[PDB]
Design a protein around this ligand. Sequence first.
Ligand code: DFV
Ligand code: DFV
Length: 211
Amino acid sequence: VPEVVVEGVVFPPVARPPGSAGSHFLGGAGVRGIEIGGNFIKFTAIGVYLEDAAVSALAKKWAGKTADELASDAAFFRDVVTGDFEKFTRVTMLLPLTGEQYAGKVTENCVAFWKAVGLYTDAEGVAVEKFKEAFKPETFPPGASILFTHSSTGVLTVAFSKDSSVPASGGVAIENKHLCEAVLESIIGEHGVSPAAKLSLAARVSELLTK
Ligand SMILES: O=C1C[C@@H](c2ccc(O)cc2)Oc2cc(O)ccc21
Ligand SMILES: O=C1C[C@@H](c2ccc(O)cc2)Oc2cc(O)ccc21
């Protein structure tokens, strides 16, 4: 597949996460903004990479479905988020943000959505602290990156980079499945904070489930 660029940030078509040797391809890459008044104001550039073994797993169900057929099924996005494979996500800052300020928003969409469904156990609470701790001493000038590694077993790994480059040596590893998927679920889920990314991951992945 081809490279996807999001507002200058250049997400290459393949990438090996920090601490991994397998190859991941780029599922999709879109912008995240919020609605200041009435304007779409861009803050981050997100890319979602999926392990190569993922094409087989998803194709079991989604082969031959159009880009819009895939783009409209919340299952295609739940499958990806919770797929029994590895997922690598890079968040690149278009606007300046601080780790303390990034992690807060992510956890309040989670530790809230878990209280909406009664799944905010001492697990989530502990995972979100270790989460909110890895981000606290960091500030992300535009160009820096946040790199999450989602494992098949639900093990989140939080690396950082000064630029769009994925570092060689890994980061922290929060050993909780919900918080792992919550992070990804919050980017390309039903309430995904990046529908552009969903659009890219729907278009690209549809052209691979026909080959
Ligand atoms: O205007 C914003 C930006 C937003 C924000 C910070 C970081 C990030 O990554 C994405 C959004 O913080 C907010 C919180 C709010 O309740 C309402 C508006 C905003
Ligand atoms: O690149 C994008 C994402 C795109 C988008 C928004 C919402 C949605 O549901 C699907 C796509 O909207 C935008 C609006 C803008 O002014 C600038 C960039 C974009």
